[PDB]
Scaffold this active site. Sequence first.
Site, PDB file in Angstrom:
ATOM      1  N   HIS B  41       0.804  -1.240   0.000  1.00 23.30           N
ATOM      2  CA  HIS B  41       0.000   0.000   0.000  1.00 23.30           C
ATOM      3  C   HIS B  41       0.835   1.289   0.000  1.00 23.30           C
ATOM      4  CE1 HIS B  41       0.112  -0.531   4.449  1.00 23.30           C
ATOM      5  NE2 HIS B  41       0.276   0.793   4.424  1.00 23.30           N
ATOM      6  N   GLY B 143       2.594   5.610  10.855  1.00 18.55           N
ATOM      7  CA  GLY B 143       3.957   5.445  10.371  1.00 18.55           C
ATOM      8  C   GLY B 143       4.603   4.104  10.697  1.00 18.55           C
ATOM      9  N   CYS B 145       3.557   0.998   9.773  1.00 16.72           N
ATOM     10  CA  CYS B 145       3.463  -0.058   8.758  1.00 16.72           C
ATOM     11  C   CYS B 145       4.819  -0.471   8.223  1.00 16.72           C
ATOM     12  CB  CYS B 145       2.548   0.365   7.620  1.00 16.72           C
ATOM     13  SG  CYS B 145       0.798   0.342   8.069  1.00 16.72           S
TER      14      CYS B 145
HETATM   15  C1  LIG Z   1       0.312   2.055   8.322  1.00 17.93           C
HETATM   16  O1  LIG Z   1       1.373   2.791   8.927  1.00 17.93           O
HETATM   17  C2  LIG Z   1       0.004   2.676   6.955  1.00 17.93           C
HETATM   18  O2  LIG Z   1       1.121   2.687   6.076  1.00 17.93           O
HETATM   19  C3  LIG Z   1      -0.948   2.052   9.206  1.00 17.93           C
HETATM   20  C4  LIG Z   1      -0.696   1.515  10.618  1.00 17.93           C
HETATM   21  C5  LIG Z   1      -1.831   1.921  11.581  1.00 17.93           C
HETATM   22  C6  LIG Z   1      -2.008   3.445  11.779  1.00 17.93           C
HETATM   23  C7  LIG Z   1      -2.396   3.603  13.230  1.00 17.93           C
HETATM   24  N1  LIG Z   1      -1.846   2.406  13.849  1.00 17.93           N
HETATM   25  C8  LIG Z   1      -1.630   1.403  12.996  1.00 17.93           C
HETATM   26  O3  LIG Z   1      -1.353   0.252  13.304  1.00 17.93           O
HETATM   27  N2  LIG Z   1      -2.023   1.308   8.556  1.00 17.93           N
HETATM   28  C9  LIG Z   1      -3.130   1.913   8.099  1.00 17.93           C
HETATM   29  O4  LIG Z   1      -3.373   3.106   8.295  1.00 17.93           O
HETATM   30  C10 LIG Z   1      -4.076   1.047   7.266  1.00 17.93           C
HETATM   31  C11 LIG Z   1      -3.852   1.259   5.765  1.00 17.93           C
HETATM   32  C12 LIG Z   1      -4.358   0.133   4.870  1.00 17.93           C
HETATM   33  C13 LIG Z   1      -3.476  -1.078   4.972  1.00 17.93           C
HETATM   34  C14 LIG Z   1      -4.471   0.567   3.411  1.00 17.93           C
HETATM   35  N3  LIG Z   1      -5.475   1.252   7.617  1.00 17.93           N
HETATM   36  C15 LIG Z   1      -5.951   0.923   8.825  1.00 17.93           C
HETATM   37  O5  LIG Z   1      -5.261   0.407   9.698  1.00 17.93           O
HETATM   38  C16 LIG Z   1      -7.363   1.244   9.078  1.00 17.93           C
HETATM   39  C17 LIG Z   1      -8.313   1.864   8.295  1.00 17.93           C
HETATM   40  C18 LIG Z   1      -9.521   1.928   9.065  1.00 17.93           C
HETATM   41  C19 LIG Z   1     -10.809   2.435   8.841  1.00 17.93           C
HETATM   42  O6  LIG Z   1     -10.991   3.031   7.621  1.00 17.93           O
HETATM   43  C20 LIG Z   1     -12.251   3.663   7.365  1.00 17.93           C
HETATM   44  C21 LIG Z   1     -11.768   2.354   9.843  1.00 17.93           C
HETATM   45  C22 LIG Z   1     -11.457   1.779  11.069  1.00 17.93           C
HETATM   46  C23 LIG Z   1     -10.183   1.283  11.324  1.00 17.93           C
HETATM   47  C24 LIG Z   1      -9.229   1.360  10.317  1.00 17.93           C
HETATM   48  N4  LIG Z   1      -7.918   0.928  10.304  1.00 17.93           N
END
Ligand SMILES: *[C@@](O)(CO)[C@H](C[C@@H]1CCNC1=O)NC(=O)[C@H](CC(C)C)NC(=O)c1cc2c(OC)cccc2[nH]1
Lengths: 302, 301
Positions: B41, B143, B145
Amino acid sequence: SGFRKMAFPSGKVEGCMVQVTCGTTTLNGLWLDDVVYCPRHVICTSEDMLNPNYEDLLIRKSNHNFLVQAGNVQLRVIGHSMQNCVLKLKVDTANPKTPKYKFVRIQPGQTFSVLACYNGSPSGVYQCAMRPNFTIKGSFLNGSCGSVGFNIDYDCVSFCYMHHMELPTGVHAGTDLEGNFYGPFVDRQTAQAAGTDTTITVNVLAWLYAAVINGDRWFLNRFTTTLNDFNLVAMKYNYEPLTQDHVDILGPLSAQTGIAVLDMCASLKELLQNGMNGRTILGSALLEDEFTPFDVVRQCSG
Amino acid sequence: SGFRKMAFPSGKVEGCMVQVTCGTTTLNGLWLDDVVYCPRHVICTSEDMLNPNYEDLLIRKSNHNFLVQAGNVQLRVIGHSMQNCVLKLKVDTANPKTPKYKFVRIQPGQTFSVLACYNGSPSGVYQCAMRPNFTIKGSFLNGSCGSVGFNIDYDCVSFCYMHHMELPTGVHAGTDLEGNFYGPFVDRQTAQAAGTDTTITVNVLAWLYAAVINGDRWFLNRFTTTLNDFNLVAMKYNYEPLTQDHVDILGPLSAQTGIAVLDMCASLKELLQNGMNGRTILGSALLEDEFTPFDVVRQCS
Ligand SMILES: *[C@@](O)(CO)[C@H](C[C@@H]1CCNC1=O)NC(=O)[C@H](CC(C)C)NC(=O)c1cc2c(OC)cccc2[nH]1
Ligand SMILES: *[C@@](O)(CO)[C@H](C[C@@H]1CCNC1=O)NC(=O)[C@H](CC(C)C)NC(=O)c1cc2c(OC)cccc2[nH]1
């Protein structure tokens, strides 16, 4: 989100660990620049450890009596000195992996990470809080002496602990890197008791804020308290008094949750008086006091 | 000599962390030999993540659109490919700090150390158990991920987890290093729910063996059970059924204490049916399920 006991990454300290042997006694040392720091009781035999006269034992030693191994490379000892309970061995080679570092003496209630080592080899890493009675609740086995505690701030390692002892109660005792024990302990083979411990109040309050930030709110109440009235109840339960500096340090967590410090004190007073009635906070059945406000802010900010 | 949750020393993994950026989207990557692994992503803008077509988004990218940095030092990307939910970027430099490594897919109940990273810089290390519902109770902020989970056997690092998601309940989800998610989760910006969780029985048994080794054995009863009868009772208490592999990994602790695995199962069954009755085991009123049999051996020996 999420809240977990977390240690600093140990890489910078792993590159400093070596094994020190004198006779049939082996433990860990910390190799910084051209000096190896280790607990002085490595010069003792099983008979000497009972009532060691360290200055007498050290004058009888020569540089060749010290075997220092860094991985599968022997380092030659070309000098030796003693600073309180720490032995310093000058070696003929500098450690290229020496990070930027400082030696500090940490205050009770503060936390640090421990890199538990055996035979100069890193084994595990965990967080400890220096208890008000100057003990730490660690996990150390035979051969762990010389393992160190540290904090990392912007590529600088602040070393604060070197491991020396396990008390009969199962808790641990050691020194700072100047060789001074935390607490009333001595490096001799005797059963030693610590002073009566107390609970680190500011850390319990910080942990209750972490619980609210993570969704646990069952313990909150509409009551409020004065600082003195809270302190009277805290001391009754063997908790340390909360100072105005501790109240100020909790400011960012109070601002983030909208719960005034004294309202969280009112909640803690109710938990101490009534107990948790079979309920948990952040998965624990007990009030946790090993997280500082900084430790909480590091995982809850934003 | 007490019992603590302990992470593996993180140095071997710290020397592999890098940052990967596409456009303004940045996350962490893992640099081993001349390949960097990271969540796919990274190729999305914030709006693309709502409903991404990864194959169509990647065909528009070239090697020159990827910024890989080890600190402020750029590693030039010379090849790219997608494997499930991970992107593999070939770089022009072999990491001199690459440890001996393997990629493994762990089972629920298995534990691992997580090296939480932000902008390719390691910030903290903690232990996590993979829950039976395929989530982990981690601590991850924006940040994070691309942060990885691992075990270290001798000097070989076994990577088992790469971070991708935070569920509405606050728990975390991710993939193995081949990009296959643990659990039913997908990499899109949507609220996803995990299945009902259960207690990790093999780990509770490991913790009861740890209590026995330490002389805390009030709970040992004089009964036994069959594995099948135990599994059927355990499921009524929201406990995971034991597998043949679980019975085998308890072997060393059973041999050390002289308490047969099925006799310990009968003791746990009585704790479930009757409760703790105010008593503690290893100073805890709750049965702990995040220490594996190896974690017990690791800390006791
Ligand atoms: C990564 O750093 C993105 O590169 C991120 C990690 C999380 C941010 C806060 N704490 C973490 O563990 N991951 C995300 O932001 C992902 C991105 C995906 C894989 C494309 N998204 C989520 O974790 C996410 C989206 C939503 C949501 O929508 C609408 C609703 C509720 C929860 C939720 N989690
Ligand atoms: C070091 O590894 C020794 O090099 C060791 C670390 C402990 C072993 C088990 N777990 C540990 O944390 N420390 C010691 O063995 C020290 C050595 C002293 C400082 C010379 N001794 C003790 O920790 C010790 C001795 C006694 C004792 O005697 C009699 C009675 C009760 C407790 C006790 N602890």
